[PDB]
Design a protein around this nucleic acid. Structure first.
Ligand SMILES: [Mg+2]
Ligand SMILES: [Mg+2]
Ligand SMILES: [Mg+2]
Lengths: 345, 345, 69, 207
DNA sequence: AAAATGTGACTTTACCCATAACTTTGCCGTTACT
DNA sequence: AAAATGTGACTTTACCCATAACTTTGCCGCAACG
């Protein structure tokens, strides 16, 4: 345990001590030693004590530099308490106050209270030490603290999260493709289409891909499930869907019941439960969607969109061609592409 | 060189006195234990007793030789014997220089004698040992890369990439059987006996020397772990520290001031579900995503799985060229079709 | 002129209930944080305090580009 | 000009050379000198050469490390030309394509043309050499490239940017204040008010 | 048919002063050996 | 009335490799002094 308390540079310094001592413990001292007599005598004595007590002398040469240092707080306790209270009740609020104004209010309160005021650096340092779920939820909300979430780490081995075999856990997810589509007859702007994906969570394989201009509803689920049955022959055993109203309907539930499909519902505002298909949406975006005219990438910051770079005046694709090339991508490119957590396509 | 007088023996007067550490690249191909894809060719580290020409311990890895490729053979030798050679001789350069190898040696009072630059005549016994290993076991294996010496004659009918069926575990068992039972009992022409008989006689003359006994506990295991090239890592939020594309996690990472900070790391190459980091002046265990998937498995297969997964990750990092080639082909026809459809309009 | 807007954000506007600051990240908005349910100010009082800030708070504050208020 | 060509590290090295040679220039050489005799002699000879044919001898002790280096391009010329063309016509385009896809297309074209394909790091590094206004305008647009546009730096005394006296240049601008307002009487939400500012450019006083 | 406006408020480094918790030393006392 | 899903394609530091370009420095001669 004494050894495990030390650091790598402690290891190096103890090794230097050992190579200083070892010639003295061999009867052949060097004729040119930079280390003086007293230091080598102390190191040798500590070597002897450690080898005579713990059965291993090297532990005596450890320094344990972590134990030294002034870990004591320098500010008075009243200032610490008042700054903690101000951070809790004036910085973790649904106002997103800047650090300077809350620091000024803290200083004014300190001056009324007669306590030693802190510095702006002190306030910033103690605010960056309270960062996390609490700050992000009392500042921006729960949907913003969701990035600062504790992961789930498996100590024991429950049922595997992504699937023991293909067609065991399969995810349904909708999105709208960041591409402006044009009509095939009259050539007006038809808006951005919607793509629904059914993904085998075990191999991350795109089982079914469907594209339609309409907002997601039971029709999208109907088409995606029919496509999944047509291409392969069997629906996935456990279909994982999100809390969208199109899944909490009467058609989808009886459809899954008819074919002995266990339906799983991810909790609201928790997208990590669909981390397989949702990431595959971004893979499609970067590999196929964002390399097409009318890619609504600039529109993320509408302050930088001009009439010359508006994708609406650049749209060239139709629904049929976009769908057929997205299917070509899904079923051949990503199909044969090797996967990180799979070691094969 | 000719020894006129009776100087110190070049081979030794008792076993364990001089342990030569050498490395070889096997002329063999290895496939996965679960897929069958050709990983490549492995590296074996041999620790041979200079006094008795007995292979005390062997180590198998897919990596190029370095300090991690000999600390492993040292810990295996301690696992099977419980004592370290008093003169552990290693190679010169930069891959064999570190601060945990020498700390390990200084802990148990061991001496390190490195090779001179580009002179292996001191370990010239290992050269004949490698020749015998190649001409007795390696070249007598199906799918051996013997014809690879003439790349012009490597036809697909005799290509070892699609011929060898050897796996890491099975070839490890065969190599241990050949080295510790066939080689250890076969008489050597140098001293005119078997290595095991010579070792037994030498131990009888030289006693047991119980003061060098080392308990093969977990503390020793941490005492013989290597470190990545950088020596540190960044603590990402909720994920942990990245070692060989695997995120190792410890609850100590939840501290606000440790996030995104550089922390020293150490990795066990015989299991990839466990690493160690340095937080709050203490070494702390870090659990990967392969710990639950390998909880309840003996250590005689954990190392096999870990080495295979390391090679798999290296090959996945190499697959990016083919991934980009397929993406480029697909995107080329997207553009083609895009240009045609714009010209049509 | 335009940066004088941003200062008005930091010194007076972003330190009020119902500010439209968290709506820059539209993807992270919930019914518990929508300012339309937290807003309590009125036009008259907001204008009065904005005038106070612009006429006696920022007016007496030293400027980096002038070394005087 | 040689002094103008020096670095602070080169200046420190020249200072060290001067401090080494200075005892040898006063008739009191030190009895403990680690630097060998040949380097001392060369430094002294160059000191004398500079004090002879330049005017001051310290200027003869300047290293000028900046000239050293291998600036020769290691890629073949056809590889350059192709990769220039692809960066021009497949990356800075109204698609915002990522660097990996354009590198893959370049590699495919290079393998068609029988030339050496540059690595991905080379592509990213040269793309990082084209940053500024032109690339941001040719990828995102003229609105986004405006950040890196230019600063007009005054050489002479033109009319001052922010005027010369109060009530000379005043700017007028409107914005949508980020604050929700409820109705005074009925309490229903009314939206975000619009703020109009007229401010003088001299004293910054909100007029 | 066309010159010629970036700011500045609010953060983040970066260096210095103070003190804890040990290593690093000299210096003298003591003792084995000649 | 209620515990358990991050993820993976893309990009970026970091180490090594080869060569250009200036400064070091031992190995030799050559002029000057004892
Ligand atoms: Mg969606
Ligand atoms: Mg989107
Ligand atoms: Mg505004």
């Amino acid at each position: 345990q004494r050894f495990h308390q030390a650091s790598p540079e402690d290891q190096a310094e103890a090794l230097e001590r050992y190579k200083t001592i070892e010639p003295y413990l061999n009867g052949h001292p060097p004729e040119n030693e930079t280390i003086p007599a007293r230091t080598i005598r102390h190191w040798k004595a500590k070597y002897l004590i450690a080898i005579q007590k713990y059965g291993c002398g090297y532990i005596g040469l450890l320094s344990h530099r972590s134990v030294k240092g002034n870990r004591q707080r320098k500010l008075p306790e009243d200032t610490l308490a008042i700054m903690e209270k101000f951070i809790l009740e004036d910085y973790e609020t649904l106002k997103q106050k800047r650090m300077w104004e809350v620091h000024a209010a803290l200083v004014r309160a300190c001056e009324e209270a007669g306590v030693i005021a802190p510095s702006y650096k002190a306030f910033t340092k103690e605010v960056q030490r309270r960062t996390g779920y609490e700050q992000t939820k009392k500042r921006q909300g729960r949907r913003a603290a969701y990035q600062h979430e504790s992961f789930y780490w498996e100590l024991a081995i429950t049922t595997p999260r992504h699937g023991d075999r293909p067609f065991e856990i399969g995810h349904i997810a909708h999105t709208e493709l960041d591409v402006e589509l044009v009509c095939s007859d009259t050539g007006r702007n038809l808006g951005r289409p919607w793509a629904t994906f059914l993904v085998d969570a075990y191999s991350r394989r795109l089982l079914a891909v469907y594209l339609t201009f309409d907002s997601p509803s039971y029709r999208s689920c109907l088409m995606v499930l029919r496509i999944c049955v047509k291409r392969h022959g069997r629906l996935p055993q456990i279909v994982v869907v999100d809390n969208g109203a199109e899944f909490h309907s009467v058609y989808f539930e009886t459809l899954l019941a008819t074919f002995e499909c266990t339906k799983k519902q991810r909790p609201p505002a928790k997208a990590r439960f669909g981390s397989v298909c949702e990431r595959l949406f971004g893979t499609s975006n970067t590999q196929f969607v964002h390399n097409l005219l009318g890619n609504t990438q600039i529109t993320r910051n509408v302050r930088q969109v001009t009439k010359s770079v508006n994708p609406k005046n650049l749209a060239v694709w139709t629904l049929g061609l976009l769908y057929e090339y997205l299917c070509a991508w899904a079923y051949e490119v990503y199909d044969t592409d090797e996967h990180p957590a799979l070691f094969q396509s | 060189y000719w020894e006129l007088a009776i100087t110190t023996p070049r081979h030794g007067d008792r076993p364990f006195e001089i342990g030569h550490i050498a490395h070889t690249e096997l002329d063999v191909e290895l496939v996965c234990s679960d897929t069958g894809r050709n990983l490549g060719r492995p590296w074996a580290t041999f620790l041979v007793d200079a006094y008795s020409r007995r292979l005390l311990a062997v180590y198998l890895t897919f990596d190029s030789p370095s300090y991690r490729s000999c600390l492993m053979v040292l810990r295996i030798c301690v696992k099977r014997h419980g004592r370290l050679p008093q003169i552990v001789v290693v190679d010169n350069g930069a891959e064999f220089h570190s601060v945990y190898f020498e700390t390990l040696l200084a802990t148990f009072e061991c001496t390190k004698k490195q090779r001179p630059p580009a002179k292996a005549r001191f370990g010239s016994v290992c050269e004949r040992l490698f020749g015998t290993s190649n001409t007795q076991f390696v070249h007598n294996l199906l799918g051996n890369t013997q014809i690879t010496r003439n790349v012009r004659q490597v036809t697909k009918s005799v290509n070892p990439k699609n011929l060898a069926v050897w796996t890491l575990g099975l070839l490890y068992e065969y190599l241990c059987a050949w080295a510790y039972e066939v080689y250890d009992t076969d008489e050597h022409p140098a001293l005119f006996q078997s290595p095991r008989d010579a070792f037994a006689a030498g131990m009888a003359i030289g006693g047991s020397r119980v003061h060098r006994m080392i308990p093969y506990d977990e503390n020793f295991q941490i005492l013989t772990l290597p470190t990545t090239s950088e020596g540190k890592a960044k603590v990402q939020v909720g994920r942990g520290i990245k070692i060989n594309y695997i995120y190792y996690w410890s609850n100590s990472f939840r501290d606000p001031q440790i996030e995104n900070t550089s922390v020293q790391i150490r990795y066990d190459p015989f299991n990839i579900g466990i690493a160690y980091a340095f937080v709050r002046g203490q070494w702390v265990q870090c659990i990967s995503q392969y710990y639950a998937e390998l909880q309840g498995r003996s250590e005689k297969e954990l190392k096999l799985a870990s080495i295979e997964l390391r090679k798999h990750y290296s090959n996945h990092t190499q697959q990016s060229k083919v991934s980009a080639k397929n993406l480029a082909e697909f995107l080329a026809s997207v553009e083609a079709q895009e240009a045609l459809l714009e010209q049509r309009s």
